[PDB]
Design a protein around this ligand. Sequence first.
Ligand SMILES: Nc1ncnc2c1ncn2[C@@H]1O[C@H](COP(=O)(O)OP(=O)(O)OP(=O)(O)O)[C@@H](O)[C@H]1O
Ligand SMILES: Nc1ncnc2c1ncn2[C@@H]1O[C@H](COP(=O)(O)OP(=O)(O)OP(=O)(O)O)[C@@H](O)[C@H]1O
Ligand SMILES: Nc1ncnc2c1ncn2[C@@H]1O[C@H](COP(=O)(O)OP(=O)(O)OP(=O)(O)O)[C@@H](O)[C@H]1O
Ligand SMILES: Nc1ncnc2c1ncn2[C@@H]1O[C@H](COP(=O)(O)OP(=O)(O)O)[C@@H](O)[C@H]1O
Ligand SMILES: [Mg+2]
Ligand SMILES: [Mg+2]
Ligand SMILES: [Mg+2]
Lengths: 354, 192, 50, 351, 62, 278, 48
Amino acid sequence: KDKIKENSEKIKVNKTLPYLVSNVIELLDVDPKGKCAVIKTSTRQTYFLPVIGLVDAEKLKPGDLVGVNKDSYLILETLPTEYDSRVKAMEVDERPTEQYSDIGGLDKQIQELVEAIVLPMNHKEKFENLGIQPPKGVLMYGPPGTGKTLLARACAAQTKATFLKLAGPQLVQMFIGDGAKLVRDAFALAKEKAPSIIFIDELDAIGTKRFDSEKAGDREVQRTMLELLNQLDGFQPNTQVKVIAATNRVDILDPALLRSGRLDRKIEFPMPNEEARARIMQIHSRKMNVSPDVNYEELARCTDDFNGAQCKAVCVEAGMIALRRGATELTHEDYMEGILEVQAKKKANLQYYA
Amino acid sequence: PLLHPERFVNLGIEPPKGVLLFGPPGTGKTLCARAVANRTDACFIRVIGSELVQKYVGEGARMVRELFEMARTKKACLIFFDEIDAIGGARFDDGAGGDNEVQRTMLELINQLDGFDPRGNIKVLMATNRPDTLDPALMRPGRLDRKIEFSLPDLEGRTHIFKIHARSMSVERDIRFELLARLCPNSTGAEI
Amino acid sequence: RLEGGSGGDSEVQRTMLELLNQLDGFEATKNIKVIMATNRIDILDSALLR
Amino acid sequence: QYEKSENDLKALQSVGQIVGEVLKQLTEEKFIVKATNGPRYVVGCRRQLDKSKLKPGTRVALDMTTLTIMRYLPREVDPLVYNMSHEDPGNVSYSEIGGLSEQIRELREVIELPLTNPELFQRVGIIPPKGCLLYGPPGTGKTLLARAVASQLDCNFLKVVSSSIVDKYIGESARLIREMFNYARDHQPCIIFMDEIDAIGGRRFSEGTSADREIQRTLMELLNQMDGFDTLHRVKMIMATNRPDTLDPALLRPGRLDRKIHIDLPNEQARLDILKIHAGPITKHGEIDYEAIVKLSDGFNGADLRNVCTEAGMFAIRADHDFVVQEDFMKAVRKVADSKKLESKLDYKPV
Amino acid sequence: NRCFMCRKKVGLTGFDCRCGNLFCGLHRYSDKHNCPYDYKAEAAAKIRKENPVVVAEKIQRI
Amino acid sequence: DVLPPEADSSIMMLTSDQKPDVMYADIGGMDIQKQEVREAVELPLTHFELYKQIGIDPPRGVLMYGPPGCGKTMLAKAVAHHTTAAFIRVVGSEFVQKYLGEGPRMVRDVFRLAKENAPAIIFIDEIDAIATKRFDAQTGADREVQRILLELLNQMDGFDQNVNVKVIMATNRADTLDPALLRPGRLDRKIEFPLPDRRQKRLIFSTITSKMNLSEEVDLEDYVARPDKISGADINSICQESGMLAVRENRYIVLAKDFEKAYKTVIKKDEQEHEFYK
Amino acid sequence: CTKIINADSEDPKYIINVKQFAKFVVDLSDQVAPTDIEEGMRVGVDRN
Ligand SMILES: Nc1ncnc2c1ncn2[C@@H]1O[C@H](COP(=O)(O)OP(=O)(O)OP(=O)(O)O)[C@@H](O)[C@H]1O
Ligand SMILES: Nc1ncnc2c1ncn2[C@@H]1O[C@H](COP(=O)(O)OP(=O)(O)OP(=O)(O)O)[C@@H](O)[C@H]1O
Ligand SMILES: Nc1ncnc2c1ncn2[C@@H]1O[C@H](COP(=O)(O)OP(=O)(O)OP(=O)(O)O)[C@@H](O)[C@H]1O
Ligand SMILES: Nc1ncnc2c1ncn2[C@@H]1O[C@H](COP(=O)(O)OP(=O)(O)O)[C@@H](O)[C@H]1O
Ligand SMILES: [Mg+2]
Ligand SMILES: [Mg+2]
Ligand SMILES: [Mg+2]
């Protein structure tokens, strides 16, 4: 026990804090007879060490990150692999709250989503007793004002798997490459956190029908996008990540994007017919002091060709309008005036009618 | 809402963070910008619309990242855009080889404007002379909420602007300006 | 001309600017001339040198 | 544990070495070498390195301080390769796929046969082919076929996305191709696979952007080291794309790209066959009319029919009937077929 | 799997309202089940947390 | 100390054994330009004072260009097999490392070795990767590339007009290049490898078909009549396809059907027309 | 000056790059508190 005390004591001394990181380039084995390896430091220098150090040859593999002594150039630590800093930004940490009672006028689509994603995350035995497969990739398309962000932030708000975001233009990088690096780092990141869902918005910005395209632009975009396709479906499939995407216009995309397995289910979003309008207005008219003589059906039938956003906006403007006169509750006339403001009335003299 | 975050709580509403100005030139938008910036009491940030177009890909977006970063850092800060027509006016694709990069940048302004974990305490003021050739995505409310326009003074706005541009100068005690503005049926404050 | 202008100056149009720096002097030729023969005549800054 | 402590005690006093290459032997003890990161030096072996093995271009290990040759080592390890060498997991043989057995056999003559029985090529006296291309609509199983083929060897197969090759530096990309063909030169029966050439492929540009020049140089390295000066042996090139029309004709001429294999949508019998393929491991009833489903089945990828099998199971999960009825098949067929109102321009002319 | 406003069995097309109850597509709205929750107060509280009380530069330090 | 002049090179010439095994008579049907180049290089080692008495000024370098697969390298690959001078093959784009001036440093390394060794032959394949015309940009690249252009011209202009150093370059696109290479003194002999004719098709068919068994019931000229705009490498693909065809038939002898299938495979993808145009 | 990547457990054990020099596993000096050293941060470090 004294001896082990002394040896460990020396170990503390010669195992100091500052280390120079490097890469495990490969391993070998020389005969007269154990293992061996070769390393490249962060200083662009290669070193050959016959004695490995305070690590395990079986644990180490080609292309690893390790803490190495500066002077001795000896392996002293095994470092957890990191990703690009931009990748670290893509992580989600807030976990907002958008429970399904908040969203309206999209029951069917909601069912088709919770089917494709929620159930696979919860009851795999149901998918196995019948036993075929879970789907692969869900897409949201339609008019911009129909509400596509709501399902994303809501479902992420409810689920507890590793939700991971992504923006369209972010994949575009200054230097060529950097999209293949970025996306691959992302997918590996979700791999590290097997309960993993990735969202992508404005997918049209990267997904575009290629053609005889000249000097710039596309000449990296389709490279990154192709990295997306291959890293998504095909070579070495996986089941520990689910993909949600959303766009506005569909016609720019490529076939390989929407083939049948890169994006499994297609969900269109039609605008509120009548009761979706009336009820959405009834939903943002939840936090406002309302005079209880108000017909949301009148409101709907007078609100024509709006979206969830605009229907929200009218309910917004009405409160300030009543705040003009300092009233507390609201009036149907208030909603009417807010409708007028939202509609962007032009002028007068339109009086030679009737 | 800024100087009185009380009424909107006592009634339970959210202010329309997105304002666009428009109308004929030489009318009082710039002036409104500078005046609001006078009592801004906030990290007001100018933005010149053409400053974003650049030679390399994505770098303009990289601007936008730092923009919304300094925004989120500086609590209660204002942003002004001006003649945003250069950014994302249309999505010209019949012969899809025209403008694409500032379209992507415009998309970045889309996302970092709204979507996925909203910004918090930020206000956006824009203004253009031709608010007619813009991508409807910006036209969606929530982003561009109010559409305030500045018109041409019928007879009396020109009178009062005679009182604005004629006041800060040396003249005799025999003033009269209604006679003047009745003589200029169509003239702006700048011409005043 | 300034096509390779603000984006690096190309090291050549500047030397051209020194050329015009010298031509904008006083010679009257006296008995000295300078000939030039070139294709691609629609790119240079001959407006100033007219 | 005391034994482990002694192990680390011995492990403490081991210092690394510098890695370099042997340029030329000046004399019996004078050598010209170069550090991998820059300049060059004049060195000597110890006594008993067996200097005959030292040749111009070999790699050696140098002493850090004394700066002399110690333990000359084999070739290097090209980290754009190990991630594409021991990476692909196993796969079912080509028995899983179907409907294109003509092509299935057809690739066998260009790849498997010429190495297994090279005698016949010599008897008739004709050199075997060199490189093959795969093209067709997405989801025809292009990647899948290569998966089955690589599933045979699983050890002597390199795979490439043809998109992770780019970088931030000026060179550093062609060199990757170099060491790829040099490792593939090392192992004799090497199979190279490159998907989606159209990223790196291109055709040509009339002096566009400089990054275009980096790309085109990176391709011309392929054009060289495909035919070039050094011929190749047992080096098979498999290419995959969607539209061949956007490629370089110089790359498309025979010799480099020997044979162009055409993949197309399934016929009626092919659709029935793949349908039977995915229909295997499915808890159902003895009621399946594959024929009607194929009858409504018009122009669907293997992944498409896979999608049909998925959706039918979805309807089965609807109402929680653990079995599978036949009608859910036709319903899912109607849905999936309806979903193809967004895919135009699926064909591309060859070349 | 069933609703509470009409006992109609559903399954996976049910709803999870703030009040902890499941509903069918007809009764998912808070006005079709008398939701006893102060949406207005969670109002006056969220806006108060997201609203930055601006301060005109005055009476700062010493 | 002063080292041997050939020590610091980092690159070697054609090694003592790497002859490509391509006979000079192996290339069937390139009599004009093969022999023409052979005098273009080797002849100015045996006939020099004619160049002084008449005045010929043998060009320092030569350029080859043509469609992709007209035997462009198939010729340089053979000349190295049947010569004795020093030979150094050169990739088009190997000098593009991300360092500062390693390109021009490598050009110095090469031409110093060429001058050093003997009368030699420097071959640069795919010069189109470098010899552009467009301009000098500034990101991190066109500096390093174009400076190596300048190094190439600098050490390309001033050898001595006496050292037997033969420069051979070749690509397929003889258009996207700087005419600074198109100067008297740098490059004079310009040679294209156009497509063959009926006769050269016959020669290539003789040379190619001369290897296989070839059962005598196959008429070679019958396929020769079909013009079809074929490149030279296409023929080899033809005999390959027919050969592996008969092999697929489990047969060690070729018949005409393998050739019908031959043009039905390679010559296929030729017909798309709308009759009403004419 | 250098840039931070991440930290470790029970201890700082900070992973940092300089800008282009090299990446190290370094620790804070005693002049600082182990609170305001969050990741993605530009921090001044001793040269020795
Ligand atoms: N049915 C609805 N209920 C509530 N809000 C809605 C509804 N439809 C649209 N919205 C509003 O739309 C706003 C976000 O825009 P939307 O989700 O329509 O797509 P977007 O603006 O194009 O962004 P994305 O790129 O995420 O689609 C939200 O603030 C939300 O309030
Ligand atoms: N009502 C007014 N009162 C005082 N000054 C005015 C008025 N209208 C216009 N002006 C003057 O005319 C000029 C034009 O006004 P402003 O800059 O707001 O127009 P603008 O829309 O920004 O111009 P543009 O459309 O060309 O960008 C201002 O500098 C201002 O001094
Ligand atoms: N005269 C000929 N006789 C026989 N075969 C020929 C002849 N000319 C060309 N070929 C064929 O063409 C091939 C020569 O390679 P190729 O001409 O493609 O090289 P290259 O033109 O340098 O290629 P690239 O310039 O596109 O890199 C040989 O495999 C050969 O079968
Ligand atoms: N005959 C088939 N049997 C089974 N799966 C198939 C078949 N054809 C296509 N697929 C499916 O479609 C996908 C084909 O993708 P891939 O070969 O990469 O095409 P692309 O490169 O055009 O995307 C595979 O993942 C596979 O699951
Ligand atoms: Mg949205
Ligand atoms: Mg203005
Ligand atoms: Mg060649």
